[PDB]
Structure formats: C-alpha cells, structure tokens
Amino acid sequence: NAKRIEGLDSNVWVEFTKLAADPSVVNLGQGFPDISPPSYVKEELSKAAFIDNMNQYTRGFGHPALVKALSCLYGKIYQRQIDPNEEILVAVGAYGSLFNSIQGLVDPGDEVIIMVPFYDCYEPMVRMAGAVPVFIPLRSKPTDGMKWTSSDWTFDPRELESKFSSKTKAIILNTPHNPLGKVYTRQELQVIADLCVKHDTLCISDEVYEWLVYTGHTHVKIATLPGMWERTITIGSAGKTFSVTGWKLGWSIGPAHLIKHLQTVQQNSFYTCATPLQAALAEAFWIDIKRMDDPECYFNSLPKELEVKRDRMVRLLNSVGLKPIVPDGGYFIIADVSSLGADLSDMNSDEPYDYKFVKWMTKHKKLTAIPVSAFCDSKSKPHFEKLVRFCFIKKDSTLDAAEEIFRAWN
Amino acid sequence: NAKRIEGLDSNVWVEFTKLAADPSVVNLGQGFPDISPPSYVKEELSKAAFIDNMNQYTRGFGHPALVKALSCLYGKIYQRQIDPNEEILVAVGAYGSLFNSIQGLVDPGDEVIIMVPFYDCYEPMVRMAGAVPVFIPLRSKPTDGMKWTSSDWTFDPRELESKFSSKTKAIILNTPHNPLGKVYTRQELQVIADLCVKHDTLCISDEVYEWLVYTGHTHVKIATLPGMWERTITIGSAGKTFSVTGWKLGWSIGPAHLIKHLQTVQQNSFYTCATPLQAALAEAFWIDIKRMDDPECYFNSLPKELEVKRDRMVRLLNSVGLKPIVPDGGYFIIADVSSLGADLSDMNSDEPYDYKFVKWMTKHKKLTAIPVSAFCDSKSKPHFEKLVRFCFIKKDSTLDAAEEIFRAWN
C-alpha cells in the first residue's frame, strides 16, 4: 500500500453496522434518517431520470442549474453576490468537499487545528496530505442549573492561541457541531477569526447543519466576519439539507483564489458529478429558495419538526438516568452514561468504556448508539469515553420502539 | 495551492466546450451519447427515487445489491468466484476508480508506464501521486492494402521491455483504446503480462468500452492471463456500459490485497457513492444478465447498433478525403487530415496542427472534433498532430446533419 495511506485503514465503523444488523434492534446509531425526504425531492429525481440529457455528462465544477441555485441561496445569506462558477465547487458530498479543501490547500509538514471531538474524517484527511493534525478539546462550563446543554461546552481562547504557530496552515471548524450539537457563538467565532488573520491561516468551515438550529440559537458564518471572506472555505451538503443522505452532493463556497485550488483536485480525481441528482437538487433548492420566509419551506419546517423529537429524546434518556446534553443544533444528542450501572468488568478488551457500553446495550437492551470516543484522537479518548451519541432524525414509530425499551429498562 | 497540484490546472477541454458553443454546429467532439439510454435504465432510476431507503446512505464500498450483480456478471466472465465485498469497489466513475488505484498503490518516485495517445487523466493522475510517467508510443504497421484499421497500430515488445526497470510500479493499459479504438490482442496482452510478472509490477486495466467490440475482434481481459489475477486492477463504467454518462459510477475488480488499498483511498476521500444511481444500476444489470445470449441484451444490441453507425462514419469520412482508421471497438473514430487543403495561414501559432484544423473545421464547416495531440505527452504530439477524433454514438438525426455537411464540404 502507498505511504500517504499507512494507518488510515481503520474502520471500526463497520463493526457498528454489524451491531445494528439484527433487525430486532432499534438503531439510534449512524446518522441515517428514517423519516421521509420531502416528496418534491423524490419527484424531481424522477422527472430528471426521464430526460436523456440529464443522464449524460454535465459540468465538471457543478451542473449550471445547481450552482445557479446555490449562488442565489447563499447570495441572500452572505448578504453578498456569490459567483456560481468561480466561487462554488460541487463535489461528492461535503465529504468530498472536505477532501477537496484539504488536498488542494494543505501541504506536507503544515499544521491543521482540529477541535475534539471531530467528524472523524478530519484526522485521516490531514495525515493523508502529509500534514500534522493539532488537537484542542472542547471543555464544559458549569450548568445553568436546570439542564445540561451544548452551549455549556466551549473552548479556552488562550489554549487556542497557544496552538497557532508559524507552521499552522489552517483550522477546521464544524458548526453546528457533530457529535456535540454545539452552535458556535459570534464571540467564539470572533476568537477563531482573530487568530486566522493574526497568523495568516485559512479556516475550513464545515456547516452542513446550518439549517438545523433550534430555538434560542442562530447559525452565524465565520466567513461573513471581517477579514474572513478572503480566507475561508464554507462547505454545505445536500444530504443534510434535504434528508437525502444517499444523494452524496455537497458544495464549497469561498473566494476564487482558494476555490481554484479545490477545483484542480476535483478535476484530477473524479472530474464531475452525477447529472440527474444535481438536476433534481437544483429544482428542490428552487422550490425552497422561493418560500424562504414561510414555514412551509424545508429550511424551517424540518428544524421545527426535529425540535419536538429532540425534546422527546432528552426525556427518554433522562428516564433511565443517562445524563443528556441537549443540543443547540444538528440531530444528534450525547449522553453521559457513567451514572448508569457500570457493568462491563467481564468484557475483555482495552477498548474504551463507550464501545464496551454500546456493545452491552446492544446485546441486552436491544438499542445501539455510537461511542463518542470514535470521534476522538487517541490521547483525548479518556476524557470522552463515558459519553455516547444518539441520533433522532427518526419517525415517531422508531422513537416509539425506543420508548418501549426505556420503559422496560429496569 | 498544494505542491501536489503544481501545474495540473490546465483544462484545454474548457476551450473545446467553447467551440461546441452552438452556432448551429453538429458536435462530434466529446464522448457524449445523444442516443437515448435504454428505457429500463431510466425506469429503475425513477422507481428508486420513490423508495425512501433508496435515498439514504448505503455500504461505503458499494451498494450491496450492486456488488452482487457485478460479482455475478464478472464471475461469468473471469470464470471465477468473485467476492462482492473484498474484490470489488464501486467509485465515482471509472474516473474515480483510476484515481483510487493510483493514490492507493503508487508512491512518489515510482515510475508508471503509459501508452500514447492515452485518456488524458492518466498523466496528471499519476503526476499528482508524485510518480514519474514513462511513455511509449503506439506505432503503425503496414496496412493490408485495403483499409486502415486500429489493429494496424501496435507496440514494439522490445521498446516496452526497455521501459521497465526496478522503479516501475505499474503500467496503465486501456482496451478498447480511447482514442484509437484498438482492441488489444491476446498476443499483445501476453507481452505485457510477461513483463509485469518478471518485474513484479502492477497492471491497472481500463476496460470501460469492453462491450463495444465490432465483428472480427474479442475483448480479452489481461487479469485472466496466467499470473495476472494477483497483480491486476480492472476498471469498468456505468456510463460506458448503459450509456448513462452522467451517472458517474465505476468499479475496480481485483484481488483483496489490492482492493483493500483502493477501499482505503475511497474511505478517506468520498466514502460512499449515491444510493439511487446504484440501486437502479443493479436492477439494470440483473435485467441484462438474465438474457446474455439474446440479441436484446444491451450488451449485444449496443455494439450492433454502433457498428452500423461506425460504417456510416467511415464512408462519410472517405466521402471527403479524411483518411479514417476503422476502430475495432469503442465509439470514436480517428481520421488523418494531412491531405486536404492543409492550409491554415489565418492561424499563426505553433500550437499544434490538429488544434488549428479543428478550429478551422468548426468555423468553415460547422463540424467539431478533438485534436488527437490532446491525448499525448509533449514529446509525442508531433507524431500525432495530423489526427482528429470524431464521436459516433449519435442518433440518426445527428449523423444525418453530418451527411449534409460532408455533402456540402466541397
């Protein structure tokens, strides 16, 4: 195997699939919506399949109707003009966008800063570019008194500064955050921008859950803050916008001198994406761009629908003493499990507590989730190994089944 | 920009899509079927769109249904039990497959051997891995007196032997060839396997047009030669197989100890491909696999539709003194132009004769084609720049409109 990929072949994720495969288990694990996508997104894929041109090659850098749509959607949010051809790249999900950003932008020997826990791909992407990932963790403050929230987690600004050196090329920021659920604040994003103009670094901002933010909270885009347009790549995703995780299209959006470089990676790796998916996506974005100010718009109605279920899953968790972190955004909730009956002494590994615990819960209670340590670099895992992540983008009947289980839990 | 991408940002094919800009010209340039796809290919994409699970994540290394069908199709072809999880990988086109093969198997400083002219991603794809492309030209033999054909082009076994040394990691082989239309012979494939076996190197085998061989030739797969299974990766296309160019789905077939590395690249780049394209393709495949021996199987009915369009195209090319090379396979035809009015004074600039001629034929005849020099290394163009490539997977209307132009040529 080539050197750029030694030791990046870990897939503990296929184990979590194996887990979840017995069909008498309720899978609250990987981020797999089992609600219906909005009918019109299904309809449009159908319409596009019957148009010959749609089934043939389309534009390397994104289907013109799709990037036309994106440029006008994000035009409004940025309070800007965004240039469909020089400032957008469409790629194989936000996953491929992150690959474009890092491969195009990051050199052997460079430092990239990653906030732990992270979408787990940040780590092996940076090591593959031959760069050094530099970790700094989120760390919790005292509560309000009532509940534990996403907002109770923060980073220490002075610790952050201490991470930047002349070797820092970039920082990767995920907000709304997976797994925490954290929606970053204008104050938190201002400290990060300060440093990556102070130091002349870039900032890769992964904002695929921009539309999922719940009440009390607002998505702010660091790329909109003074001095950051020049130096930010902000990445979005079809799968999370439109509950269509199987479409696998996403976008990078930033300045031409950076998008250039993403562009060359795409051109030399897979070249173009699928045409019917982009065609149909662009119709769906149109159906929703035009009603942004109504609640019938998917950007509004989905978080409204998911908030109810967030609060339903908090309660369920609380009802067995799994101590939940009510999330500000996204559609995972994390729960401390340690005040549960630590019960795994006879399970023979030095994996982390949470893998062992999730294994046990899957065996005995018939529910699966994901251990937070999966989202941690190896030196950080002990600080996070009693934490476990559940996904709630699910239909009622699934939250029902899970309700069944927690009632009978003791 | 990252060093890995230095000067791989030229896309001369943006300028060609400029000439295809459409002052009533018949565009005979890019590989862009304008026939319809098979009706059931389209049908299954729609059916899929309406199933909710068909719009959510699937197995990262290929939709299970889909790798099942590949394994059953290719096992019929390889004469062997092919394991659908460990010997296949589904990627974003053949284009993504080659990228997987290279990134995961080639190191900086390895040498990779390439036959010119070559599908044009090979040089950059290998150059991006920091390897050194080593080139060897295809050369003409005396014709049988009667016709020029793709099999009048071959390689020199001793010249090939001398491009191998201990830095050679691999040779890239493309058959049927784009743009020659050559179907490599058993005897030619034999000389390659000898050198791969003696030098312990890999062969990456690009066989997307593998079903498009015409009367008097067979596709044989180098992977099936004694000793080549363990050293070969062989790549196919949804685009080329079902005329669905915008679906961008391809696959690598090969031994576990090679696929696991491609899997690794896949997993740290794009992760999974699209569920609905792949659900439908699977069903497209099953449909044609159950009628392999029948004239209605798309695998038989396509080559046969196409032979006729080819023979039509050779006449037209002759009608007007463009000396065509009749291809044994694929859906491109190359034509020698040297002997017309040759005569391009408007067009100062040593860039290459074929580019100037394609520009000319666009302006004055409203026909576009692709200059063959575009599939060469720089040191090879002079040996190929009187050659021009035309595409014929075209509906009757389109070839019709071509007749009217050759008919009016003089």
Curated annotation (Swiss-Prot), chains A, B:
Naturally occurring in which organism (per UniProt): Mus musculus (Mouse)
Catalytic activity line of the entry: L-kynurenine + 2-oxoglutarate = kynurenate + L-glutamate + H2O; L-kynurenine + glyoxylate = kynurenate + glycine + H2O; 3-hydroxy-L-kynurenine + glyoxylate = xanthurenate + glycine + H2O; an S-substituted L-cysteine + H2O = a thiol + pyruvate + NH4(+)
Modification N6-acetyllysine, positions: K76
Encoding gene (name): Kyat3
Keywords of the record: Acetylation, Aminotransferase, Lyase, Pyridoxal phosphate, Transferase
Residue sites binding substrate per the record: G31, N178, R389
Residues that bear N6-(pyridoxal phosphate)lysine: K240
Subunit structure: Homodimer.
GO cellular component, one term: mitochondrion
pH dependence: Optimum pH is 9.
N6-succinyllysine: modified positions: K76
Needed co-factor(s): pyridoxal 5'-phosphate
Any one Gene Ontology BP term: L-kynurenine catabolic process
High-level lineage: Eukaryota, Metazoa, Chordata, Craniata, Vertebrata
Annotated protein name in UniProt: Kynurenine--oxoglutarate transaminase 3
Temperature optimum or stability note: Optimum temperature is 60 degrees Celsius.
